[PDB]
């Protein structure tokens, strides 16, 4: 799955004032990401507010993104739901729309065993019908640090093409790379991107790529050139942003920056997310202006 | 909300081998719980496998349980989703079908503030159109211990009529009762029911009540009569069963017991839940036979 | 386990009074032992966490053990908490407990460094050997130790030869019941004072607690009320205990207790050792009012 | 922070050799000090967790401090970990560190009892006063201590008067970067050896680690490779360190390290103190083979 290697934005879902999909802003956001030189888009993930959308709504996003982006950048459909059948429906739809890959978060909420996770992934792969699968290692959600044997099991499942390493454990990052030298291994926490690459990730998937994807592409290139100072500098700038976004609320802060970038019409998330606290708007607008100047 | 007090079974949702809703087994389960002398049913909760069902399916179940049980026992609809809008849709449906109350788990997965949980409950309460609301204190999911002040804010939200205390912290159970003398306070962990009552809970909502609700009613009665020994003995028997169900998988183990009690046609949970390991079937069948004899 | 039957009951986890220079206040320590004997406490648990053992040297701990033995041997049951991280240090305290005439030893699961479960077992075996006949109380406090024993592991620990009891300092009352179910004759001490009534109901047959220093009689009252089937009295007593515990959590538990004991004319100077700070002066009125209230309910 | 810049670098967290009877092996201690110096290490961190401080008496820890200072003062930097639960005990060790001529002191956040943040700050202030001019290395540590500091709390700790450095025993490299961003001149030691390269990239300017005892030159290699922009050499070296760390985690880290040193003819007897058990015999060939491989990397 070498063709899945790279820096992929986890696409946000713009909503209108009534919390319905803002189709026009979705299309603007897809093109905005393409123009940033991003390798691909990760669509319908946690970042896309998948877990406050219906299946129909998730499919509509997939279809529109494919319309805008197919044959220009890589497209990975996050089809994960708690339910295997629901996840399967989305995988089949991803295949129809011509996505390059599917992905599923570890089924959550209820206590599922590792065996049940594996069967879940097998069924989704079947429904994906030739599309490779990106599986997760996400301890914050699962409540489990899986062993290296379990990871081997996961990443050697027939059809699995990559691992989204959504963990800040860079010893485990290095251990996974050592065990699987050819594995596509996405760094999941944007705020350790540079260090995650050094530890052995060969790319990433992240929410903040939407507004500053060129910075992350800059880190990749700097590290390839042995330019440690440039890499560090860029990560420091990314982290200044992540500091602010955690204060504001990450998705809504991102949408607001995009609103000031003239991409997103209405920067709301779906309830129960509240609006951005108005005291942060000047910082978010200033950030949008700073980012716009970096282009 | 005092009429919401008591022992409420968290109803399981029967499915068939296609993973479709088994409507005949659902009606049978509802009647079986009524015949156990249960005070009510808590429908479409986590226990009811809500989070692997669509809104429509949850509505179908709510409507059918209301058909079978409205007027005979108390009915609480769990309408909780991550999405407020979705929760409001189910709240409005619960009202239409004639439920006595609604309930919603803390919105999960994403990081939401306590203020955002409160606005979420307010929106659901509005859509429930006069039905009282049961809120949760569920640290295992929320990943936080709520201050007494936060609980105090929660239970005094307008329209909130009970707290589902899904915590094994019996110091906090007492603190809550001490602060809110008239609060309807449901013990959430079946395996500490007797001790939870002793600490201040005045009832419970439980998945295991589906197969042995009379034992939990028996603990209420024994504690009211000052019969500590019978209370302890019954809790011990419930915990022998809980030990087994934790090994088998709780929901599928319960459905399997009900299958052996001739209530549920097919004891499956929805994928990604797998089947019960067949080595446990003799124990589960033997347990069904023991429970049937207790009635007898 | 049946041979350990005489260890069943309500045991105060003794505090260690210090003077203004943070040295042992022997006169106050002797006072506190006698105060606890006069409350009709079944026994004393000496040199535990409550005693500030982990800010004491070995010699200081032996000194406390020897003094308490001088005051109380033969009058009430005495359990010596001998636990340190080091097994050799623990053994030295265990031998001393035997020399001074203690009825039992106890050890917290060795902490800080991750030790294997087999290493915990050998630690307990070594201490049991040095205790030379005195039975062992296994002391379980996941919240402070950071040691997370499984039920299987607990079952193995409590059946080690020479083990006569379990100090269960856990709020998990499902586990409490599971332990009782597996070991019908085991002496099973409830460790969190704020759930005492519920813990007894779940299957503890007594408790070891720091708050017993100032209101042991309330906890004995709960044991009696449950045994008689008087659930109302049991609940009411537990509620009063929890009102006190609410205050103590605000003030800091050890120092709040010593302050109450100061106002009861037991403890001269209610200091804990650094880095414990002093009680906030705004809480003194509440602490004095509690001392007065508690002195009243004895008649 | 700028005036304690000379503590920047790669500092081995010194192990404490014990003899067959588990008493201090002074001879082997002197030999381990010289072994570390000959590796080109910048300094030693003495009497930390790694040095088995928490299974030693105060006198034993002082004896170790005196011996190391004898062997190494003036040749490399020396940091005395003086941390105990007790402030007065930490102050004794701090006064001794000053007497033996150490360059800095350090103290783990006091553990077991749940101290407030203000209490932690006063504990450090008191130790800083007793160290009488030696700068303090503070801790940010949860996995071992159990103490869970916020970033704002870390920022207050590291700016206390007399604090010259932070030992960041955390795998959180976002926080590592945040700390560097807030404090440009702070000496910031990477605490987890297994992420050393990544930790330097995030902002650490050196480290303190147990595995430096057997392969310190590899970590100095990483520093140098990263300074020269040779990312592949850095990754390669970190990968080799991690293969060793994988084995040490299987064997038990301190005892595994001691066994490697025994095979390198640095340490006479590779025992840790009870309740640490011995290395399982089945790992000995791997440990001997590791010793030979490391001896070859410099011979
Ligand atoms: Cl995502
Ligand atoms: Cl439920
Ligand atoms: Cl104690
Ligand atoms: Cl150390």
Residue numbers in the entry:
A (entry chain B): 2 to 296
B (entry chain C): 2 to 297
C (entry chain A), D (entry chain D): -1 to 297
Relevant lines from the article:
In this report we present 11 diffraction data sets, in multiple space groups, from the E. coli enzyme N-acetyl-neuraminic acid lyase (NAL), which present twin lattices and incommensurate modulation. NAL crystallised in four different crystal forms from the same crystallisation conditions, and in the same drops (100 mM Tris-HCl pH 8.0–8.2, 200 mM Na acetate, 18–22% w/v PEG3350). The development of twin refinement in REFMAC, which at the time was only implemented in the experimental version of the program, allowed the determination of several apo- and ligand bound structures of NAL and the proposal of the first detailed mechanism of the enzyme reaction.
Interestingly, the three crystal forms in space group P21 were not related to each other, two of them were twinned and shared the same twinning operator, which made the monoclinic cells a pseudo-orthorombic cell. With the P21 indexing choice, POINTLESS initially assigned the space group C2221 but reflections belonging to one of the 2-fold axes were much stronger than the others (data not shown), which is consistent with pseudo-merohedral twinning in P21, and indeed with this choice the structures could be easily solved. Although they could all be solved by molecular replacement, they could not be refined satisfactorily using standard protocols. As a general rule, whenever only a single lattice with no incommensurate modulation was present, indexing, data reduction and molecular replacement were possible, but the (non-twin) refinement stalled at Rfactor and Rfree values of 30–35% for all datasets (resolution range 1.45–2.3 Å, <I/σ(I)> cut off = 2.0) where we would expect Rfactor values near or below 20% for well-behaved refinements. Refinement with the program REFMAC (versions 5.6 and 5.7) identified the twinning operator (−h, −k, h + l) for all the cases, in which twinning was detected. Twin refinement resulted in improved models with Rfactor and Rfree values ~18–20% (data collection and final refinement statistics are summarised in Table 1). Inspection of the packing using the molecular graphics program COOT25 highlighted how not only the inter-monomer contacts within the NAL tetramers were different, but also the inter-tetramer contacts in the crystal lattice. We speculate that the likelihood of NAL of crystallising in any one of the four forms is determined by small differences in the interfaces between tetramer during nucleation and the early stages of crystal growth.
